[PDB]
Amino acid sequence: MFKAVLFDLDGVITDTAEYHFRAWKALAEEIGINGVDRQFNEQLKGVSAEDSLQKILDLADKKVSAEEFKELAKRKNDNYVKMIQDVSPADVYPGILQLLKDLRSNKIKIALASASKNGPFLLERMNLTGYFDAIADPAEVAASKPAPDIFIAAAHAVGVAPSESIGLEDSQAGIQAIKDSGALPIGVGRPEDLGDDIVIVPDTSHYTLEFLKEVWLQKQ
């Protein structure tokens, strides 16, 4: 039986996309550009701050200095850190808390494998810190998803091999990263999005210890 579960944060444990979105929108408004709505934001999700800022400026054909670019990027980070101060246990996705408790009680290791620079803060605010055996630090990992590096680190950090682990993700790049680590992916979302070769559940309320065990037993 699997010895650990490696969690992404965004789309699995909670929604942090909402808060990047508002921070980009508050920046764009602040400098009198818009078009920064939830559709356009599809172009900003999981892309570099640099890339996000370019695309926003192109909305108004706006030109900036290097110092101005740097200040806008910082402003957005500031905005984001202000906006997540509201995060609470209320923001934990369905089934996630019960899953963590059942994993812990069965002595299965729990690790976070997230690019979030605020993972430890967010998990504290959601009252989930105690369940986690480790949080992979993205500042200490060489390559971002879909590279496997983050999931390897999260497994290693709790004393297991990725081939002893299940990884939970909602993104194409995240699923691929789990696969290349050697871990077994269980997706949350749409096969249209994440592939036909893996077990996908429609939402997080399907992520149960029972379900995870049945999938493990039925794997490759």
Of the ranges 9-17, 27-35, 80-88, 151-159, which one interacts with Mg ion (CB under 5 A)?
A: 9-17
- Min dist. Cβ of residue 171 to Mg ion (A): 5
Has 8 been annotated as catalytic?
yes
Complete DSSP assignment for the chain: ---EEEE-SBTTTB--HHHHHHHHHHHHHHTT----STTGGGGTTTS-HHHHHHHHHHHHT----HHHHHHHHHHHHHHHHHHGGG--GGGSPTTHHHHHHHHHHTT-EEEE----TTHHHHHHHTT-GGG-SEE--GGG-SS-TTSSHHHHHHHHHTT--GGGEEEEESSHHHHHHHHHHTPEEEEES-HHHH-SSSEEESSGGG--HHHHHHHHHT--
Nearer CB in complex with Mg ion: 149/170 = 170
187 binds Mg ion (CB under 5 A): no
Under rule CB under 5 A, which residues in 151-170 are in contact with Mg ion? Answer: 170
C-beta of 8 vs 149, nearer to Mg ion: 8
Instruction: Mark whether 37 is an active-site residue.
Output: no
Out of 2, 6, 11, 201, which residue is the one contacting Mg ion (CB under 5 A)? 11
79 binds Mg ion (CB under 5 A): no
List residues binding Mg ion (CB under 5 A).
8, 10-11, 170-171
Active-site annotation, residues: 8, 10
